[PDB]
């Protein structure tokens, strides 16, 4: 569930501004505002992506390196005959 959330957060990054040739006075201001908002949008997306990656790494480490045996390893060796 953490890996799926990290993938969904990384696959929805903020796009860049739509560049247009020969702009006008209002178009230049709109492009400047879009570039100023992108400077924070990309930073927030990078921070959220790094947080999701750090959470997924810890989750994978906890799932792999398990105390007392390991992943899908029975610590008790005095059960019945459960070969299947």
């Amino acid at each position: 569930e953490t890996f799926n959330e990290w993938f969904k957060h990384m696959n929805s990054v903020p796009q860049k501004p739509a560049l247009i040739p020969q702009p006008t006075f209002t178009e230049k201001v709109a492009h400047e505002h879009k570039e100023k908002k992108y400077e924070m949008d990309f930073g927030i997306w990078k921070g959220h992506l790094d947080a999701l990656t750090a959470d997924v790494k810890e989750k994978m480490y906890n799932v792999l390196l398990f105390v007392d045996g390991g992943w899908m390893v029975d610590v008790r060796e005095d059960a019945k005959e459960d070969h299947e």
Binding site: P14, T26, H33, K37, Y38, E39, D41, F42, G43, I44
Partner: protein, 316 residues
């Protein structure tokens, strides 16, 4: 929307006013630091980003900040000094031209509550119950109403020139006048009891009799000045105390309000005296907010976690 860190607890956020007949949005905005040993009043200028232009040290906690014109910015300190941070429009510097240190004092130091911005005057209020009415290029105040109330003011809204309406700490809204005789108010409008405490007060841009206020419980009360002495509509919103609440100057249907729980809800009634749609611009996690500014398409606010949210596309 995007947030920016500044390592300072922002206590106020007011956008700069545009020129006459301008077709662009708000790009510059002022801020006020508080709850620190060295408060500063910087001014930012615009994923989005924003850079700092000029900054100046301010003595005391900036409890209120309002721009009087395109180059003037009135600030209310915590020591009763109503210093107007007149920004230089030539070399882009933050200096101090006129200041009134004896605007709010106890005869101790009373902290200044709210401060109105109206050209060419200066209406402010403090914790000592003094409603001064200063002006531009004036050493002394033109009118000072010394109220003998047991409560303390928190905000002050101006409806018509020159009659303003302040809110005390008992949930009452008193209306006074600068050209009136005595120290008593003309009208008094309170809520149910004296346990709720109002902290924000703002009037509509089109209706001079309708005004919205917020108590200490998070319920947005919309009362009128000619409809009895109680609130016409009392609808709850948040759970903590209401910080700041102000509507838009372009459209009177949209109105934003800040609380002490960390939620910047933006109500959209597109009348307040009569299904309102509420949408929170910010989520949880972050701490409480102090103030929030709205100038048509842009929206700037300040939080207590050393953050400043800015969004120049509220309807796009």
């Amino acid at each position: 929307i995007y947030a920016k860190f500044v390592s300072q607890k922002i206590s106020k956020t007011r956008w700069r006013p545009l020129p006459p007949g301008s077709l662009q949005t708000a790009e510059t905005f002022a801020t006020g630091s508080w709850d620190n040993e060295e408060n500063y009043i910087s001014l930012w200028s615009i994923e989005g980003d924003h850079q700092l232009l000029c900054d100046i040290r301010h003595h005391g906690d900036v409890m209120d900040l309002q721009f009087f014109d395109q180059e003037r910015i009135v600030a209310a300190s915590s020591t009763g000094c109503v210093t107007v941070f007149l920004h230089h429009p030539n070399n882009q510097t933050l200096s101090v031209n006129q200041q009134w240190t004896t605007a709010h004092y106890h005869t101790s130091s009373a902290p200044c509550t709210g401060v109105v911005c109206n050209n060419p005057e200066i209406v402010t209020v403090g914790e000592d119950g003094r409603i001064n009415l200063f002006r531009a290029d004036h050493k002394e105040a033109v009118r000072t109403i010394d109220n003998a109330d047991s409560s303390t003011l928190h905000a002050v809204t101006f409806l018509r020139t020159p009659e303003i309406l302040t809110v005390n700490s008992i949930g009452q809204l008193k209306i006074w006048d600068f050209r009136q005789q005595g120290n008593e108010p003309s009208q008094i409008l309170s809520l149910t009891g004296d346990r709720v405490p109002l902290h924000c007060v703002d009037r509509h841009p089109n209706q001079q009799h309708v005004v919205a206020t917020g108590g200490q419980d998070g319920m947005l009360s919309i009362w009128d000045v000619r409809q009895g002495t109680m609130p016409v509509s009392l609808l709850k919103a948040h759970e903590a105390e209401m910080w700041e609440v102000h509507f838009h100057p372009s459209n009177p249907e949209h109105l934003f309000t800040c609380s002490e729980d960390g939620s910047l809800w933006h109500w959209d009634a597109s009348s307040w005296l009569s299904r309102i749609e509420i949408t929170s611009l910010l989520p949880s996690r972050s701490l409480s907010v102090n103030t929030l500014d709205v100038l048509g398409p842009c929206l700037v606010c300040g939080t207590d976690a050393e953050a400043i949210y800015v969004t120049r596309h509220l309807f796009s």
